[PDB]
Design an enzyme around this catalytic site. Structure first.
Site, short mmCIF file in Angstrom:
data_model
loop_
_atom_site.label_atom_id
_atom_site.label_comp_id
_atom_site.label_asym_id
_atom_site.label_seq_id
_atom_site.Cartn_x
_atom_site.Cartn_y
_atom_site.Cartn_z
N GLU A 72 57.02 -5.74 31.07
CA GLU A 72 57.64 -5.23 32.29
C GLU A 72 58.00 -6.32 33.28
OE1 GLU A 72 55.81 -1.49 33.84
OE2 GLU A 72 54.78 -1.53 31.89
N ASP A 109 44.22 7.52 34.42
CA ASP A 109 43.45 6.49 33.68
C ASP A 109 42.25 6.08 34.57
OD1 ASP A 109 42.47 4.10 32.60
OD2 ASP A 109 44.44 3.39 31.95
N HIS A 162 45.12 3.26 29.22
CA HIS A 162 46.49 3.63 28.86
C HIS A 162 47.27 2.46 28.30
CE1 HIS A 162 47.47 1.93 32.82
NE2 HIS A 162 48.76 1.98 32.49
N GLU A 180 48.93 -3.41 40.94
CA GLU A 180 48.68 -3.21 39.51
C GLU A 180 50.02 -3.43 38.80
OE1 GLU A 180 48.69 0.07 36.64
OE2 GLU A 180 48.98 -2.06 36.15
N1 LIG Z 1 59.78 -5.73 42.30
C1 LIG Z 1 59.26 -4.57 42.74
N2 LIG Z 1 59.34 -4.26 44.08
C2 LIG Z 1 58.81 -3.06 44.53
N3 LIG Z 1 58.19 -2.20 43.64
C3 LIG Z 1 58.09 -2.52 42.32
C4 LIG Z 1 58.63 -3.70 41.86
N4 LIG Z 1 58.39 -3.77 40.52
C5 LIG Z 1 57.72 -2.68 40.13
N5 LIG Z 1 57.55 -1.88 41.23
C6 LIG Z 1 56.83 -0.59 41.27
O1 LIG Z 1 55.46 -0.89 41.06
C7 LIG Z 1 54.79 0.20 40.49
C8 LIG Z 1 53.89 -0.30 39.38
S1 LIG Z 1 52.90 1.01 38.61
C9 LIG Z 1 51.56 0.90 39.82
C10 LIG Z 1 51.60 2.09 40.76
C11 LIG Z 1 50.47 2.14 41.79
N6 LIG Z 1 50.33 0.86 42.57
C12 LIG Z 1 49.19 2.41 41.04
O2 LIG Z 1 48.36 1.48 40.98
O3 LIG Z 1 48.97 3.52 40.48
C13 LIG Z 1 55.88 1.18 40.06
O4 LIG Z 1 55.84 2.22 41.02
C14 LIG Z 1 57.20 0.42 40.18
O5 LIG Z 1 58.33 1.18 40.61
#
Ligand SMILES: Nc1ncnc2c1ncn2[C@@H]1O[C@H](CSCC[C@H](N)C(=O)O)[C@@H](O)[C@H]1O
Ligand SMILES: Nc1ncnc2c1ncn2[C@@H]1O[C@H](CSCC[C@H](N)C(=O)O)[C@@H](O)[C@H]1O
Lengths: 337, 337
Positions: B126, B25, B274, B117
């Site tokens: 989420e 994206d 997305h 993010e």
């Molecule tokens: N409470 C939490 N502690 C650690 N990781 C978490 C979390 N909640 C969500 N995540 C993780 O956060 C990510 C969000 S998607 C974002 C992915 C990456 N930072 C990017 O910008 O492309 C996912 O990998 C998910 O597993």
């Protein structure tokens, strides 16, 4: 986790849209109705168990065929929608909805025939076949099962377009400079993940490169535990030269009635169903000349997510080119468009 | 069921293909890169925390902008892949991957800036913003958050085809003899089921019948508990006369840095992301003439499936005509083609 998988599984079947999706498969629903109705002597005045009744549709077919009483067992919330249908169709005297898992309910009596639609992708997905076999604790010694047998077919295919399309997705992770970041240390992990995905789709039968190999499960005879480890050895006699990109899978089921045997096939030679067909891609295709033999084994190991860990090892005997693959049947790529 | 849903959530993010999906994206990833690099002084020689690093991408952008030390926290098995990338990119000195939940790990020190993010469908899906907010236990009192603020927009729309489509689908059940079965008693339930699904799709901005209402979360100020119940009162003054079929939702985030403010927008007036946009239908359309006032409340109530129950009540003040809907944001209908 198993209880996590199980909750999601029955939630899926609690949706009317999903019951509707199976019901609207005319090949499936019409073929079940034909099996049952053309085998009416098997139902007439008999006691029936419908394992996993959903909307109740197969129980209605048993009733049309003259069954005296039908125990319609359903574990999702769909059970209450089924009961609404039994009431609105004035069949409360004959169809008895039993909410709960077939493993956990207790029925008033033994039954003459068990009916079910327990088939997932590649036949074995969802592991509902085990619940179907578990239910034989309710079957009279003289009893029948609808479906009676299941055949898994397996044949090697050539499909460069499919292979490249999956390869290309994986090769996002071959980039040395995605926004300035080298991703390439992950490329092999990416190929591994992408090729773990079975491909659910249909195809032209001309992509098939040898006569299918057949593996048969007899539901009248099999035991639940028989499905924990399914070993399917194969030796294909190569009919066309070319690259073998993987193995295609489909399945047939037979309803072996006292009046006639009716077959439901998901073969690519046959009219398309909501099961399509399933292909397991090799990470690197095997080259074979017509007349070669391609041998190995497909092994399915029941896991705790109501599915199977699949391992396929295949080798071209003449050259010793070997491909080894692990597939997660739980998580297919639905390619169909 | 809370434990259950979390298992599936983190497994989803363990797939490189799901990481790839967000990374590809361009709007999203390119804007984060620009926000960080264009605000280089908020990063140079600073301590950073990346909450939910996934592949590590945002941490790599913090390294490009010159950060001294970046703690990249990740709960899924993607943390192991993130570490491989930190090593292969020769950044072991500067990026430290910490596997685990941000609520459960320990950091060796307080940070100058938190990047993440955490946004889902209509911003809040989420429930990851709660983890982002939680992470401020690691933030120095002077510290910043990237993104700094998030705006959710709501606007009434007219879309006759979308509305009628729900019935068209549910009317599968409205037949007296589907293979001999009267299905019609379940038509009302099938209607309810389709209406409970938010619709993820994009649309022509001309369907929008009033100026949007904005609800702002300031991530510097807000507490985790603030997101458990999101009450969005609205008063739309209708720009056009027509039938209101529901509310459309999109969101923007701002990165408020020392050098400049950068926006990432998912608005229907912007290039597509997305996240698309989200539409929640009313059970019954509301007629409103231009200059009329459509008033009510959208109530977002967090649930234990890492999502929100959406409660919308609305009325046209001039007529008293009212409508509502209750939707489950966890199970949206993905309609985009
Ligand atoms: N409470 C939490 N502690 C650690 N990781 C978490 C979390 N909640 C969500 N995540 C993780 O956060 C990510 C969000 S998607 C974002 C992915 C990456 N930072 C990017 O910008 O492309 C996912 O990998 C998910 O597993
Ligand atoms: N162990 C079990 N006990 C009771 N129902 C089960 C079950 N395992 C699966 N099911 C149910 O079996 C159904 C399979 S789909 C088949 C539905 C219906 N018989 C039809 O042919 O259209 C689902 O509704 C699922 O919830």
């Amino acid at each position: 986790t198993e209880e996590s998988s199980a909750v999601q599984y029955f939630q899926f079947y609690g949706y009317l849209s999903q019951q509707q999706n199976m019901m609207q498969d005319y090949v499936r629903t019409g073929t079940y109705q034909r099996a049952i109705l053309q085998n009416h002597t098997d139902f007439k005045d008999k006691i029936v168990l419908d394992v996993g009744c959903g909307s109740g549709i197969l129980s209605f077919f048993a009733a049309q065929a003259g069954a005296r009483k039908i125990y319609a067992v359903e574990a999702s919330t769909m059970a209450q929608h089924a009961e609404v249908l039994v009431k609105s169709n004035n069949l409360t005297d004959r169809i008895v909805v039993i909410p709960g898992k077939v493993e956990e309910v207790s029925l008033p009596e033994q039954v003459d025939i068990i009916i079910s639609e327990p088939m997932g992708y590649m036949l074995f997905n969802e592991r509902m076949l085990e619940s179907y076999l578990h239910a034989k604790k309710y079957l009279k010694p003289s009893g029948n099962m609808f479906p009676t047998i299941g055949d898994v077919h397996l044949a090697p295919f050539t499909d460069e377009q499919l292979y490249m399309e999956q390869f290309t997705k994986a090769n996002f992770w071959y980039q040395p400079s995605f926004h300035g970041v080298d991703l390439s240390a992950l490329r092999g992990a990416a190929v591994d993940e992408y090729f773990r995905q079975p491909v659910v789709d249909t195809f032209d039968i001309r992509i098939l490169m040898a006569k299918s190999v057949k593996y048969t499960v007899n539901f009248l005879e099999a035991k639940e535990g028989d499905l924990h480890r399914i070993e399917i050895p194969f030796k294909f006699h190569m009919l066309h030269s070319g690259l073998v990109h993987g193995l295609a899978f489909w399945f047939d089921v037979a309803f072996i009635g006292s009046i006639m045997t009716v077959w439901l096939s998901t073969a690519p030679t046959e009219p398309l169903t909501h099961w399509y067909q399933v292909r397991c891609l090799f990470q690197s295709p095997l080259f074979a000349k017509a007349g070669d033999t391609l041998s190995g084994t497909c092994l399915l190991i029941a896991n705790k997510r109501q599915s199977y860990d699949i391992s396929i090892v295949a080798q071209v005997d003449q050259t010793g080119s070997k491909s080894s693959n692990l597939l997660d049947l739980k998580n297919p790529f639905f390619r169909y468009t």
